[PDB]
Symmetry: D2
Subunit: 406 residues, 4 copies
C-alpha cells in the first residue's frame, strides 16, 4: 500500500502568482488545459498500489477546491482528500501534524510532492529504487547549470551509493550542479526525524529543506534519485507558460488525444496545441506552438495565437495577435489588438535564464516578461498591450507598454 | 426646497484607486479622518432648505455603503438615499435616468457634485448667484496654471455676464486658464437639454461634459461661478494624501476640535494632525504635518509620522519612520522599518505637478510617488519600503525600492 | 418590432420559495429541467419580430443570473438584458421606471409576463387579437372554479367586446370566474396611464393590478383574451412540482426529444419523465409519472421516483422510494430511505385545492404537502422523511414526520 | 502553568440554533450581552497560572470569529488561539489531533469546556480538588431530577472517593441523578487513553463521552467534582433565553456594573436588566425581568420588554409588547405590535421541563416555545407574532400564531 501527499500552499504562497491567483487558487490554475495538481494526481493514480492521495495546505475549502476534489475522485477512482492545516506550518510541519492521517492503514511508502513543480513524475522508477534500498528519505534531483543552481536547493552527493552528503537551499557559491526537484519518497521511518525537529522547536513550523534535509545530510538517511526528464518550478504567473510548453511536449507520449490536429474545417495548427472541446475556434485563425485553449473560448477569424494560455470564457475578436501571453477568465480582446509578451522561461539549464526573484523590477524598470491579463479585462480595439500586467476587472482605453496597470 | 445629487462612481471608476479600493469603495475612503463623500454631505447639510441628498452610482449595496448611509442619516438629520443605476450611464445618464426621483417634491435647484473632488464647497455663494440669475446650468470653476489646464475641463467665458462661450474637456492647446471644479448647480430646466441628448442617442450613456456642456456652450444656458478656495481631484491612490492636506488645513476654520493639540501626556505634534479618539499613540512618537490617524491604530514609541494617512487597525511598531505614505487597514509595520514615499501633489497651480495619467510608469520605470500599503500588509523589522506599491495581504521579507509588489 | 418584459421578483418575493430559494434565485429554479423563466424566454423568442427580452427585478446580479443571461443570449439568438431596479417598485413601478429602455427603438407592442406563472404562453394568438383591436392593455385570462377565484384576480368582462368592466384582485365574495393569468400585452399608449398613477403618488411604487387595472376597468382601455391552455402560479416551493407536471405534459407537443423513452439498457419509465443527459440512472430504477432529473444526478438500483424533482448533484442510493418530493442540490438520500410527500397541486379548477396562504400551518399543525429537501441535506439509511421540510446543510439521523427541520 | 481548551462546534452543530445561527456562529451569540464563549474565556482568565486559551472547532475563520479573537486577546490579556480541525472529529478527536499544541510548554493541567454550557464555572475549586488528588480525568457534575437525567449524561459514582463507576450518555432507565456538566479537568496523562481509542479505530472521530468516559468508568481514571451552582445547556435557540436569565442572576455578584439601575431620566426597570451603553431606550418604556439589550437598539416609548433578548440594530417602535422572545439583528417591530412567546427553560431540576429533542413539533403541532425573529425581520404595525419562528429577511403583513414562517 502506497500513499501520496501533495503539499499545496496557501493564499500567502500564491501571492507571487498574483494576477491569476486573484480568482482561483494557484494549485487549480490550468497548465496545458488541466489544473496544475491534476498532473500530480494523474501520475500518482498511475502507480499500482496507490490507495489515497492527500492534499495538505492552508487554503480554506471553497467551491473550486471542493469541485476539483469531487471531479478528481470521480475521474481517477481514488480517494482524494484535503487536509487543511490550522496555520501555515511550513513544508514539513503539515507532514508532521497530519502524521496519523498519513500513516493510517500502515503504508509501505508515501510520496511527497510540492504542488508547484512541473515534472514528468518518474514515481515508478523512484519507488523501485526505494524498494531496493529502503532508506527513510529519497529525493528526486536533476542536473542544472552552474549559474542557475544558486536559485535551487543544491545536493552534494556521493556517486557510488547515491547518498547526499550536503544540502544547501540557496548557496551564494557553487557547491553542486544537482538540484532538488521537490519530489520525495518517504518511508514511515522518515516521520521519526521530523518529530525530533518539532521537539527542538519546543525547548510548530518545520521547514523540510532547512531543518530536516540540510541537518541530516551525510548521516545516511537521505538519498538521491537522478532523472533526465522535464522539470520546472511554477513560482510567478509567467512560469506557468513554460510549464505549459513542457506538458504539451509530454502530451505527445502521454495523452496524444489531447493535442489538436489539422482539420479541413478547422484552424491551422503549428506545434503542440491543446484546444478544449467546448471552445469554438474560427477556421481562419492559426494557433502556433505551445498554445492552450480553455472551455467556452471564442476565437475569431484571423487570430494569431502563439505560446499562449487562454483561460476559460475569454473572447478574442478578429485579426487579434496574441504572443507570449496569459489571457484571463472572461477577458475580452478587441479586434486588431496585439497582446504581446517577451519570452521568459525559468529553466535551470539556460545560462541567461532569469534569476527569478520576488521583484518583477530592475532599477525602477519593469522587466520584459509574459503579458498577463487578469479576469474580466477588456482590451479595446486596435490597442497594443506589450510586456504589461493588467490587474483584473480593468477596462483599458489606450495602448500600454512595459507597465503594471493597477 | 433644495436637493443634492452626489455622483459617486462604480467599481470600474475606482480601479485607478486600486490598492486602497480593493477593500472599501473609493467614495468611502477616509480623507482627513472622515470618508470622502462625507465632506460633500457635510457641506450640503449646512445649506438651509436642503431636503434630501441622493447618491447616484453603480456600486452594489454592500455593508460599508449601507452602514455609511445609516450613519450619515443619523449624523446630519437628513435623508441620504442611494440610487443604484442598472448600468454605468456616464455622468449625465444617471441624472437623466433618475429624473423623477430628483424632481420629486419640486425642488428649486439641485446641486450636482462629483464625489472625487476635494473642495471648500461654496454652495451658499453659488446658490445665491443662481438665485440672482436663474440660469439652467451653473458651473464652479477655478483658475489653473497654463500647463496644468490641459489636464482638466477648460471653460472659456465672457467676463461681464460670466457665461461660458466654449468648453473643451481635455484640450491639446491652451484655450483657457479656468477649469471645471466638478461642482454644478442645476435648475429643473436643466433636465430638459439632457433629454434631447438622450433622444439623439436613440436615432443611454450621457457624458455631462462632452455631450451637454461642450455642445450648449455659448447659447446662454451654462454660466460660471469662480472661487478661490481649495480644490483637488482625487483620481489615483496618492492624490488622497494631498486632499487630506487640504482638508486638514480647512479644519482650522471648520472643525477646530478635530485637529490634535500638544498634550503633556501625549505625542509631539507639528502642523495639522488628526487623531481618532480610539487610536492609542505613544508619547515618544512625533506626528508631523498633515497626518491622519484612524480608529484602533496603535502607534509605538519613537514613531515619526509625516504627511501620512494611517488607516484603521494598522500597527506601527517602535522607532518606525513613515513619510508620504498610506498605511492600509490592519497592516503592520515592524520596528525600525522605514516606509517612505516621494511627495507628488496633484494641484492645478504647480507648473511641475505631474500630468496624472492612468500609467504609473515612464520608460519602464515606476514614477516616484506616494508609497501605498494595502490592507493586512506585514512589513518586517528594519526593512525599507521606498516609493513602492504593495498589494493587500502581502507579507514582505526584505527591502523594496521603486517597485509594485504584486 | 416587439419586445418582452419579464417581471422577475427580488429576494423578498422569493422568501415564500424559501428552502429552495436559499441557494438559487426563484426565477432560476428548474421546472421540468430548464429554469422557470427560460420557458418565458423560449415562448417570446418563438414570436416573429421579437427584438429584445428585458428582465426587470431587484435581484443583485450574481453568477447564476449572469450565467443564465449569457446562456440564454447564446441559445435563443436574442439580446436578453437584466434591468435592476434601485428599490422594489411593485409590478408597475419597474415598467414605468424603465420606460425609456422599454420604448427604445419604438416597438409596436411589448408583452409583460410575471415570472412565476406556468403557462402554455399563447403570445401569437394574443398578439393577433391585439393587432386587430389595438387597445392599450390586453390581459390573458382563464376560467376558474367559483371557490378558487377568490385566490386570484377576478375579471368581470363584457362578452361581446371582451372588455373588462371590473377588476378585483382578491374578492371576499364571488364576482367572476375569469381570473388574471399574469400575461399582458401592452401598447406604448399603456405607459401613459402609469405616469398618471405615479403623479398621484407624488401629490414610486406602482402596483399594476390595484392602481392601474382596478381603477381603469370599464373605461375602455383594458381588454381580455381568454385561453384554455395550461396555467399555474408558482408561489410556494411545492407549487413548482405541479408546474413541472404541466410542463412535462406540454413537452409531448413542444419538445418531444426532452421526454425520456423506454431503453433496453435503461430504466423503466412511466408517464412523462425528463432525464438530463449528464445524469446516470441505474437500469433497475423505475421513474414514474412527472419526474424531472437534473445534471450529475446518480440514481441507484431499485430507486422508485414518482412525481418528483431531483435537482443537480443529488444522489439517491439503492432501493430508495421518493414520492411527491423535491430533492435539493447535492443532497444525498441513503439506502432504503423513503422521502414521501402528500400531493397538493395548486390549480384553480379543483374545488378542494388548497387556499395557498403564506402560512404552511393550520391550528399549530403543519399541513400535509410536498416534502422539500434543501441543498446538501444528508438523509441517512432506512429513514423515512414524510411530509417534512428540511432546511439546507442538515444531516439527519432519524425519521421525521410532518415537521419543519430547522 | 495551566491551559484551557474550549470545544466550540462547527456549522453542523449550530443547525439546531438555526434562525439565530444563520448570521453569526452559535459560539458568538450574545447571552446576557456578551458572546457565549466569552463567559468561558472570562472564567478561564480569572484562574491564576492560565497561560493560553485554545478554541477547537471546525468553523471556518471569518470576520466575526477573528474579530472576537482579537477583542478577547486585548480584553483578557491572554493568547486566545483558534485551532481549526480539518474535519469534524467529535469531542475527543480534536483534543487528540491537537495534542502537540495543547501539551506545548508542558502544562500542569488543562480545562476542557464545552462551549454550549452556561455555568458558574467553578474552575478554582475543581483545580484544587485536582491538585489534591491528581487523577487523569476530573468531571464536573450536578444533581438533576429523576425524569430529566435521561436527557443528560448520567454518572454513577462512589461517594467516598468521588470516583465514577458507570457512565451512560442517554439512558432509557434511571441509573443516576448526577449528570455531566460538560466541564472537565484533564491531566496530561489523560491524552494517553484517547490515543488507545484512536488506535482501536484504525484496526479519527473520537466521542469523548461514549468512547472514553463510558469505557474507562470504574477503572480509577475518571473522578467527579459536584457543584451546586447554575448550569444550563444551550442547544436550541430558545435555551439561550434561560441561559441569559441565569447569567443575569450571576451578574449580581460577578459584574454589578453591567446590570441597569433605576434612573430618573431613564426607563423603569424590574429584575435584572442588561442595557448596552450604545442603546437608546425611551424613558416611558419599562424593561422587566431578565432582559438583555444590545448595541444600537432603539426602544420606543411605552415598550414593554420582559424575559427577552434584543440583538444589535433592532428597533422596537412605540407601545410594543415583547415577552419571551429573541429579536434578531436589525429586525424592526412596528407600533402596537405584540411579539409573544411561551416560557420554555430547559433546566434539569424542573420535572415538567421539556424533553429537548431535535423536533420542535408534536403530532404535527408546533410546540409552544420562545418566539424567535431572525435578522432583518420586519414586523408591521398592530400585528401579533405568537409562539412563532420567523426566518431571516422576512417582511410580514399579518398576524401569525404557532407557526414557522419560512
Ligand atoms: N502545506 C503547506 N505547504 C506549503 C507551505 N509552504 C509552502 N508549501 C508548499 O511547498 C512547496 C515548496 O514550498 P517552498 O517553500 O516555496 O520551497 P521551494 O522554493 O519550491 O524549494 P524546493 O522544494 O527545494 O524546490 C510548494 O508547493 C508550496 O506550495 C505550508 O506552509 N504548508
Ligand atoms: N453615477 C455615475 N457617476 C459616474 C459615472 N462615471 C463617473 N462618475 C462620477 O463622476 C465624477 C467625474 O467622473 P469622470 O468621468 O472621471 O470626470 P472627471 O475626470 O473627474 O472630470 P471633471 O468632472 O471635469 O472634473 C466622479 O465622481 C465619478 O465617480 C457613472 O457612470 N455613473
Ligand atoms: N420587478 C418587480 N417585479 C415584481 C415586484 N413584485 C412582484 N414582482 C413580480 O410580479 C409578479 C406578480 O407579483 P405579485 O405581487 O406576487 O402578484 P400575483 O400575486 O402573482 O397576482 P397576479 O399578477 O394577478 O396573477 C411575480 O412574477 C413577481 O415576481 C417588484 O417589486 N418588482
Ligand atoms: N471541536 C469539536 N467540538 C465539537 C464537536 N462536536 C461537538 N462539539 C462540541 O462539544 C460540546 C458537546 O457536544 P455534544 O456532542 O452536543 O454533547 P452534549 O450533548 O452537549 O453532552 P455532554 O457533553 O455530556 O453535556 C459542544 O460544545 C459542541 O459544540 C466536534 O466535532 N468538534
Amino acid at each position: 500500500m502506497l500513499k501520496a501527499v501533495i503539499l499545496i500552499g496557501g493564499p500567502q504562497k500564491g501571492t507571487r502568482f498574483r494576477p491569476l491567483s486573484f480568482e482561483v487558487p494557484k494549485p487549480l490554475f490550468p497548465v496545458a488545459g488541466v489544473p496544475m495538481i491534476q498532473h500530480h494526481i494523474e501520475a500518482c493514480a498511475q502507480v499500482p498500489g496507490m490507495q489515497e492521495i492527500l492534499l495538505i495546505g492552508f487554503y480554506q475549502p471553497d467551491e473550486p477546491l471542493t469541485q476539483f476534489l469531487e471531479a478528481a475522485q470521480q475521474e481517477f477512482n481514488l480517494p482524494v482528500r484535503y487536509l487543511q492545516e490550522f496555520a501555515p506550518l511550513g513544508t514539513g510541519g503539515g507532514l508532521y501534524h497530519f502524521r496519523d492521517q498519513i500513516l493510517a492503514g500502515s503504508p509501505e511508502a508515501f510520496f511527497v510532492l510540492n504542488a508547484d513543480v512541473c515534472s514528468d513524475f518518474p514515481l515508478s522508477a523512484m519507488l523501485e529504487a526505494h524498494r531496493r534500498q529502503r532508506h527513510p528519505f529519497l529525493l528526486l534531483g536533476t542536473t542544472a547549470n552552474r549559474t542557475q543552481s544558486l536559485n535551487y536547493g543544491c545536493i552534494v552527493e556521493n556517486p557510488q551509493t547515491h547518498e547526499v552528503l550536503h544540502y544547501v537551499e540557496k548557496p551564494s557559491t557553487f557547491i553542486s550542479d544537482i538540484i532538488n526537484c521537490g519530489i520525495y519518497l518517504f518511508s514511515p521511518e522518515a516521520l521519526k526525524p521530523l518529530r525530533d525537529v518539532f521537539q527542538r522547536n519546543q525547548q510548530g513550523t518545520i521547514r523540510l529543506e532547512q531543518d530536516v534535509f540540510s541537518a541530516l545530510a551525510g548521516q545516511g538517511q537521505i538519498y538521491v534519485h537522478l532523472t533526465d526528464g522535464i522539470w520546472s518550478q511554477i513560482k510567478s504567473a509567467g512560469s506557468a507558460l513554460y510549464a505549459s510548453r513542457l506538458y504539451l511536449s509530454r502530451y505527445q507520449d502521454t495523452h496524444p488525444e489531447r493535442l489538436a490536429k489539422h482539420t479541413p474545417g478547422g484552424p491551422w495548427i503549428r506545434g503542440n496545441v491543446y484546444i478544449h472541446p467546448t471552445a469554438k475556434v474560427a477556421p481562419s485563425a492559426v494557433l502556433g506552438p505551445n498554445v492552450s485553449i480553455g472551455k467556452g473560448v471564442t476565437v475569431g477569424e484571423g487570430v494569431r495565437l502563439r505560446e499562449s494560455i487562454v483561460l476559460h470564457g475569454a473572447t478574442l475578436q478578429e485579426h487579434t495577435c496574441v504572443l507570449h501571453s496569459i489571457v484571463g477568465w472572461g477577458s475580452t480582446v478587441g479586434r486588431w489588438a496585439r497582446v504581446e509578451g517577451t519570452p521568459s522561461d525559468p529553466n535551470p539549464n539556460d545560462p541567461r535564464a532569469r534569476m527569478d526573484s520576488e521583484s518583477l523590477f530592475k532599477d525602477g524598470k519593469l522587466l520584459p516578461a509574459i503579458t498577463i491579463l487578469g479576469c474580466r479585462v477588456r482590451i479595446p480595439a486596435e490597442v497594443l498591450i506589450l510586456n504589461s500586467i493588467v490587474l483584473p476587472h480593468k477596462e483599458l482605453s489606450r495602448s500600454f507598454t512595459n507597465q503594471i496597470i493597477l
